[PDB]
Amino acid sequence: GEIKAIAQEIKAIAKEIKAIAFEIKAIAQGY
Amino acid sequence: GEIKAIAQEIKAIAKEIKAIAFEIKAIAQGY
Amino acid sequence: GEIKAIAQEIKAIAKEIKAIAFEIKAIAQGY
Amino acid sequence: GEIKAIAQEIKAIAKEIKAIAFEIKAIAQGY
């Protein structure tokens, strides 16, 4: 399941990105 | 799926990130 | 080649995201 | 690859985005 393992990692990174993006959005709005 | 399904979930998240990136960009420009 | 087509779309979106991210970074630094 | 290769290229780009997101976050916080 190599391709699934990589797809899994990608999905995990993508979720981190999305979380960081909302955090940046909040910082930007706050100032 | 399985890997099609995961690919579609990644694609959905990537679309969300892109949307939030555009929002951040507009907020950052406005200020 | 369904899975390749979706992987292709994902990669294209990811590149857009990365471009928008450098743009936001430049706006943030500029102010 | 092919789809493994594309998956690895997506993963690399996602890592770059995440890195730039952290940079943006730090810049935005600092100011």
Side-chain angles (χ1 to χ4, degrees):
Chain A
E2 284 172 37
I3 283 143
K4 173 169 154 155
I6 299 162
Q8 231 89 265
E9 180 159 6
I10 296 173
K11 171 171 79 178
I13 298 162
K15 286 178 156 162
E16 294 176 302
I17 294 166
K18 178 164 58 164
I20 300 157
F22 282 129
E23 282 157 18
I24 293 162
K25 178 187 167 182
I27 294 158
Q29 291 188 310
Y31 295 134
Chain B
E2 288 193 322
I3 95 101
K4 183 169 171 185
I6 293 174
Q8 294 176 310
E9 177 164 7
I10 296 171
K11 180 167 58 156
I13 299 165
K15 290 181 179 171
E16 293 181 309
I17 294 164
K18 177 161 75 170
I20 303 166
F22 287 128
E23 287 173 5
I24 297 170
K25 190 177 174 190
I27 297 164
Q29 275 175 341
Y31 286 121
Chain C
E2 284 172 37
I3 283 143
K4 173 169 154 155
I6 299 162
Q8 231 89 265
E9 180 159 6
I10 296 173
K11 171 171 79 178
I13 298 162
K15 286 178 156 162
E16 294 176 302
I17 294 166
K18 178 164 58 164
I20 300 157
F22 282 129
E23 282 157 18
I24 293 162
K25 178 187 167 182
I27 294 158
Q29 291 188 310
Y31 295 134
Chain D
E2 288 193 322
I3 95 101
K4 183 169 171 185
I6 293 174
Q8 294 176 310
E9 177 164 7
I10 296 171
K11 180 167 58 156
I13 299 165
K15 290 181 179 171
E16 293 181 309
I17 294 164
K18 177 161 75 170
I20 303 166
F22 287 128
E23 287 173 5
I24 297 170
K25 190 177 174 190
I27 297 164
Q29 275 175 341
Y31 286 121

Short mmCIF file of all heavy atoms in Angstrom, two decimals, chain A:
data_model
loop_
_atom_site.label_atom_id
_atom_site.label_comp_id
_atom_site.label_asym_id
_atom_site.label_seq_id
_atom_site.Cartn_x
_atom_site.Cartn_y
_atom_site.Cartn_z
N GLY A 1 0.79 -1.23 0.00
CA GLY A 1 0.00 0.00 0.00
C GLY A 1 0.82 1.28 0.00
O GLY A 1 0.49 2.23 0.72
N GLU A 2 1.87 1.34 -0.82
CA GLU A 2 2.76 2.50 -0.86
C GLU A 2 2.03 3.76 -1.23
O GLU A 2 2.34 4.82 -0.73
CB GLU A 2 3.88 2.31 -1.88
CG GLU A 2 4.98 1.39 -1.42
CD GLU A 2 5.96 1.07 -2.54
OE1 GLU A 2 6.25 1.99 -3.36
OE2 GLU A 2 6.41 -0.10 -2.62
N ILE A 3 1.18 3.69 -2.25
CA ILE A 3 0.54 4.87 -2.74
C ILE A 3 -0.48 5.42 -1.75
O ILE A 3 -0.65 6.64 -1.62
CB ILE A 3 -0.08 4.63 -4.11
CG1 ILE A 3 1.03 4.64 -5.16
CG2 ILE A 3 -1.09 5.71 -4.42
CD1 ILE A 3 0.83 3.64 -6.28
N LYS A 4 -1.10 4.51 -1.00
CA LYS A 4 -2.04 4.87 0.04
C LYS A 4 -1.31 5.54 1.21
O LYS A 4 -1.80 6.50 1.79
CB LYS A 4 -2.83 3.63 0.52
CG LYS A 4 -3.73 3.88 1.72
CD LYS A 4 -4.69 2.71 1.99
CE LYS A 4 -5.11 2.66 3.46
NZ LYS A 4 -6.42 1.97 3.66
N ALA A 5 -0.15 5.00 1.56
CA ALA A 5 0.66 5.58 2.62
C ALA A 5 1.05 7.03 2.31
O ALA A 5 1.01 7.88 3.19
CB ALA A 5 1.90 4.76 2.85
N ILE A 6 1.49 7.29 1.08
CA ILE A 6 1.83 8.63 0.64
C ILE A 6 0.59 9.53 0.57
O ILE A 6 0.63 10.68 1.01
CB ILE A 6 2.53 8.65 -0.75
CG1 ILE A 6 3.85 7.86 -0.70
CG2 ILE A 6 2.85 10.09 -1.17
CD1 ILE A 6 4.34 7.48 -2.09
N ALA A 7 -0.51 9.01 0.02
CA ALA A 7 -1.76 9.78 0.01
C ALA A 7 -2.18 10.15 1.43
O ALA A 7 -2.56 11.29 1.71
CB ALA A 7 -2.84 9.01 -0.68
N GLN A 8 -1.98 9.23 2.36
CA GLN A 8 -2.23 9.48 3.76
C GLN A 8 -1.38 10.61 4.34
O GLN A 8 -1.86 11.42 5.13
CB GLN A 8 -1.94 8.21 4.55
CG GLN A 8 -3.05 7.81 5.46
CD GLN A 8 -4.06 6.90 4.79
OE1 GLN A 8 -5.08 7.38 4.28
NE2 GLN A 8 -3.83 5.58 4.88
N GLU A 9 -0.09 10.59 4.04
CA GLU A 9 0.79 11.64 4.50
C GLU A 9 0.41 12.98 3.91
O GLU A 9 0.43 14.00 4.59
CB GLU A 9 2.25 11.33 4.15
CG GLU A 9 3.17 12.43 4.63
CD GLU A 9 4.64 12.01 4.79
OE1 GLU A 9 4.99 10.86 4.43
OE2 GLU A 9 5.43 12.88 5.24
N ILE A 10 0.16 12.99 2.61
CA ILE A 10 -0.30 14.21 1.97
C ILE A 10 -1.53 14.79 2.67
O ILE A 10 -1.64 16.02 2.87
CB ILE A 10 -0.61 13.98 0.47
CG1 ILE A 10 0.67 13.58 -0.29
CG2 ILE A 10 -1.23 15.24 -0.15
CD1 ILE A 10 0.42 13.16 -1.74
N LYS A 11 -2.50 13.93 2.94
CA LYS A 11 -3.76 14.40 3.54
C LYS A 11 -3.48 15.02 4.91
O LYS A 11 -4.08 16.02 5.26
CB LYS A 11 -4.79 13.24 3.63
CG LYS A 11 -6.06 13.59 4.46
CD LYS A 11 -7.14 12.49 4.35
CE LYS A 11 -6.82 11.30 5.25
NZ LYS A 11 -7.87 10.21 5.23
N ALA A 12 -2.55 14.42 5.66
CA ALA A 12 -2.18 14.92 6.97
C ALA A 12 -1.50 16.28 6.88
O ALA A 12 -1.74 17.17 7.71
CB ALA A 12 -1.25 13.92 7.66
N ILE A 13 -0.59 16.42 5.92
CA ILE A 13 0.04 17.71 5.72
C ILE A 13 -0.99 18.75 5.32
O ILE A 13 -0.93 19.89 5.77
CB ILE A 13 1.16 17.66 4.68
CG1 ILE A 13 2.27 16.72 5.14
CG2 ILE A 13 1.79 19.06 4.48
CD1 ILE A 13 3.20 16.28 3.97
N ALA A 14 -1.85 18.40 4.37
CA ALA A 14 -2.89 19.32 3.91
C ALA A 14 -3.73 19.82 5.10
O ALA A 14 -4.11 20.98 5.15
CB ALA A 14 -3.77 18.63 2.91
N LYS A 15 -4.10 18.93 6.03
CA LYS A 15 -4.86 19.36 7.20
C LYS A 15 -4.08 20.32 8.07
O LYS A 15 -4.64 21.30 8.57
CB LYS A 15 -5.32 18.16 8.04
CG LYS A 15 -6.48 17.39 7.42
CD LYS A 15 -6.84 16.17 8.30
CE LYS A 15 -8.32 15.76 8.04
NZ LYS A 15 -8.64 14.38 8.50
N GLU A 16 -2.77 20.09 8.24
CA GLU A 16 -1.96 21.04 8.97
C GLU A 16 -2.00 22.40 8.29
O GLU A 16 -2.03 23.43 8.96
CB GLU A 16 -0.51 20.57 9.03
CG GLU A 16 -0.29 19.31 9.81
CD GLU A 16 1.16 18.82 9.76
OE1 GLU A 16 1.71 18.57 8.66
OE2 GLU A 16 1.75 18.68 10.85
N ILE A 17 -1.78 22.40 6.98
CA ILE A 17 -1.81 23.65 6.20
C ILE A 17 -3.10 24.43 6.43
O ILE A 17 -3.09 25.66 6.62
CB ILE A 17 -1.58 23.40 4.68
CG1 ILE A 17 -0.13 22.87 4.43
CG2 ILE A 17 -1.76 24.71 3.93
CD1 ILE A 17 0.04 22.29 3.05
N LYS A 18 -4.23 23.72 6.33
CA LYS A 18 -5.52 24.35 6.49
C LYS A 18 -5.63 24.96 7.88
O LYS A 18 -6.11 26.08 8.02
CB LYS A 18 -6.65 23.31 6.29
CG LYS A 18 -8.05 23.94 6.50
CD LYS A 18 -9.24 23.14 5.96
CE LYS A 18 -9.36 21.75 6.54
NZ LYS A 18 -10.74 21.17 6.29
N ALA A 19 -5.17 24.25 8.91
CA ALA A 19 -5.19 24.80 10.27
C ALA A 19 -4.33 26.06 10.37
O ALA A 19 -4.71 27.03 11.04
CB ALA A 19 -4.72 23.75 11.30
N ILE A 20 -3.12 26.01 9.78
CA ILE A 20 -2.23 27.16 9.86
C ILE A 20 -2.85 28.31 9.11
O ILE A 20 -2.81 29.46 9.57
CB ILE A 20 -0.81 26.89 9.29
CG1 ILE A 20 -0.12 25.74 10.06
CG2 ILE A 20 0.04 28.19 9.44
CD1 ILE A 20 0.99 25.04 9.23
N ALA A 21 -3.46 28.02 7.96
CA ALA A 21 -4.17 29.08 7.21
C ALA A 21 -5.26 29.80 8.02
O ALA A 21 -5.29 31.05 8.03
CB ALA A 21 -4.73 28.56 5.89
N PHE A 22 -6.15 29.06 8.69
CA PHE A 22 -7.12 29.75 9.57
C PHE A 22 -6.47 30.57 10.68
O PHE A 22 -6.92 31.68 11.01
CB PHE A 22 -7.98 28.69 10.25
CG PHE A 22 -9.05 28.15 9.34
CD1 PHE A 22 -9.16 26.74 9.20
CD2 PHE A 22 -10.03 29.00 8.80
CE1 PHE A 22 -10.20 26.22 8.42
CE2 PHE A 22 -11.00 28.46 7.95
CZ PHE A 22 -11.12 27.06 7.81
N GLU A 23 -5.35 30.07 11.23
CA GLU A 23 -4.58 30.84 12.23
C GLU A 23 -4.03 32.15 11.71
O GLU A 23 -4.15 33.19 12.37
CB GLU A 23 -3.46 30.00 12.84
CG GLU A 23 -3.99 29.03 13.88
CD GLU A 23 -3.10 27.84 14.11
OE1 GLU A 23 -1.91 27.89 13.72
OE2 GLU A 23 -3.61 26.82 14.61
N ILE A 24 -3.44 32.12 10.52
CA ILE A 24 -2.98 33.33 9.84
C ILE A 24 -4.14 34.25 9.55
O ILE A 24 -4.05 35.46 9.76
CB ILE A 24 -2.29 33.00 8.51
CG1 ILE A 24 -0.98 32.23 8.77
CG2 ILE A 24 -2.08 34.27 7.71
CD1 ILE A 24 -0.46 31.48 7.48
N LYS A 25 -5.23 33.70 9.02
CA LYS A 25 -6.43 34.52 8.80
C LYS A 25 -6.86 35.27 10.10
O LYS A 25 -7.08 36.48 10.07
CB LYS A 25 -7.57 33.66 8.22
CG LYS A 25 -8.86 34.43 8.03
CD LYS A 25 -10.00 33.53 7.63
CE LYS A 25 -11.35 34.24 7.75
NZ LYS A 25 -12.44 33.32 7.41
N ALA A 26 -6.90 34.58 11.23
CA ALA A 26 -7.28 35.20 12.51
C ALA A 26 -6.29 36.31 12.94
O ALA A 26 -6.70 37.36 13.44
CB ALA A 26 -7.40 34.15 13.62
N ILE A 27 -5.00 36.06 12.75
CA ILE A 27 -3.97 37.06 13.08
C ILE A 27 -4.12 38.29 12.21
O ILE A 27 -4.06 39.43 12.71
CB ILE A 27 -2.53 36.49 12.95
CG1 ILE A 27 -2.32 35.41 14.01
CG2 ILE A 27 -1.51 37.63 13.10
CD1 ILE A 27 -1.21 34.42 13.70
N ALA A 28 -4.31 38.07 10.92
CA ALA A 28 -4.52 39.13 9.96
C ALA A 28 -5.75 39.99 10.28
O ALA A 28 -5.71 41.22 10.17
CB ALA A 28 -4.65 38.54 8.54
N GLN A 29 -6.88 39.35 10.56
CA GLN A 29 -8.09 40.07 10.95
C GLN A 29 -7.94 40.85 12.28
O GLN A 29 -8.56 41.91 12.47
CB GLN A 29 -9.28 39.13 11.04
CG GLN A 29 -9.70 38.62 9.68
CD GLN A 29 -10.99 37.83 9.67
OE1 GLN A 29 -11.17 36.90 10.47
NE2 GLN A 29 -11.87 38.14 8.72
N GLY A 30 -7.13 40.31 13.19
CA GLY A 30 -7.06 40.78 14.58
C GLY A 30 -6.36 42.12 14.61
O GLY A 30 -6.83 43.07 15.26
N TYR A 31 -5.31 42.23 13.80
CA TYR A 31 -4.62 43.50 13.51
C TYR A 31 -5.28 44.36 12.41
O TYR A 31 -5.63 43.87 11.34
CB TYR A 31 -3.15 43.21 13.18
CG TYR A 31 -2.36 42.63 14.36
CD1 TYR A 31 -1.52 41.53 14.20
CD2 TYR A 31 -2.48 43.19 15.64
CE1 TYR A 31 -0.80 41.00 15.27
CE2 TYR A 31 -1.76 42.67 16.72
CZ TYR A 31 -0.92 41.57 16.53
OH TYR A 31 -0.22 41.05 17.60
#
